[PDB]
């Protein structure tokens, strides 16, 4: 019954692939709630005019 | 009702609030705090941090 979200952000100079490097992820947010989620989407933004 | 300032005892308006506590298995969040007293250094004591 705890949704945990861990996050990290790094500067990148290589073009495409995941860098061959190591950088741990810091804990960010905890939520003491309970839901049975099993499917997740991912949103997007666009320009409309 | 016809509430008036001249209404006698048992007839005047009375505001009532009822608090009901529910104990769902979801993690508890509404709790009363405990009085943190103070800290003391250089004395063999016991602590509840
Ligand atoms: C799905 O959610 C339920 C409740 O939100 C979770 O808990 C139990 O689910 C089983 C399903 O048959 C039942 O015993 C009750 O509906 C629930 N019991 C209690 C005490 O809550 C369940 O664990 C969740 N499942 C998943 C996979 O997330
Ligand atoms: C994002 O990248 C820029 C340069 O590419 C860098 O200066 C900045 O610190 C980066 N920010 C994060 C959050 O990684």
Curated annotation (Swiss-Prot), chain A:
Query: In UniProt terms, what is the effect of altering residue 24 to V?
Result: In strain: 20A.EU1
Question: What's the reported outcome of changing residue 15 to E?
Answer: In strain: Omicron/XBB.1.5, Omicron/EG.5.1
- Highest taxon of the lineage: Viruses
Residue positions with a glycan = 36
**Consequence of changing residue 17 to G:** In strain: Beta/B.1.351
Q: What is the effect of changing residue 12 to V?
A: In strain: Omicron/BA.2.75
Q: How does it assemble?
A: Binds to host ACE2. RBD also interacts with the N-linked glycan on 'Asn-90' of ACE2. Cleavage of S generates a polybasic C-terminal sequence on S1 that binds to host Neuropilin-1 (NRP1) and Neuropilin-2 (NRP2) receptors. Interacts with host integrin alpha-5/beta-1 (ITGA5:ITGB1) and with ACE2 in complex with integrin alpha-5/beta-1 (ITGA5:ITGB1). May interact via cytoplasmic c-terminus with M protein. May interact (via N-terminus) with host bilirubin and biliverdin, thereby preventing antibody binding to the SARS-CoV-2 spike NTD via an allosteric mechanism.
Q: What does the protein in this record do? A: Attaches the virion to the cell membrane by interacting with host receptor, initiating the infection. The major receptor is host ACE2. When S2/S2' has been cleaved, binding to the receptor triggers direct fusion at the cell membrane. When S2/S2' has not been cleaved, binding to the receptor results in internalization of the virus by endocytosis using host TFRC and GRM2 and leading to fusion of the virion membrane with the host endosomal membrane. Alternatively, may use NRP1/NRP2 and integrin as entry receptors.
Q: What is this protein called?
A: Spike protein S1
Show which stretch of the intact protein is covered: 199 to 247 of 1273
């Amino acid at each position: 019954g705890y949704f945990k979200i861990y996050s990290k952000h790094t500067p990148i100079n290589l073009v495409r692939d995941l860098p061959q490097g190591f950088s741990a992820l810091e804990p960010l947010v905890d939520l003491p709630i309970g839901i049975n989620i099993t499917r997740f989407q991912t949103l997007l933004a666009l320009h409309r005019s | 009702y016809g509430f008036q300032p001249t209404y006698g005892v048992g007839y005047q308006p009375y505001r009532v609030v009822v608090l009901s506590f529910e104990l769902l298995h979801a993690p508890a969040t509404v709790c009363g705090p405990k009085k943190s007293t103070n800290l003391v250094k250089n004395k063999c004591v016991n602590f509840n941090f």
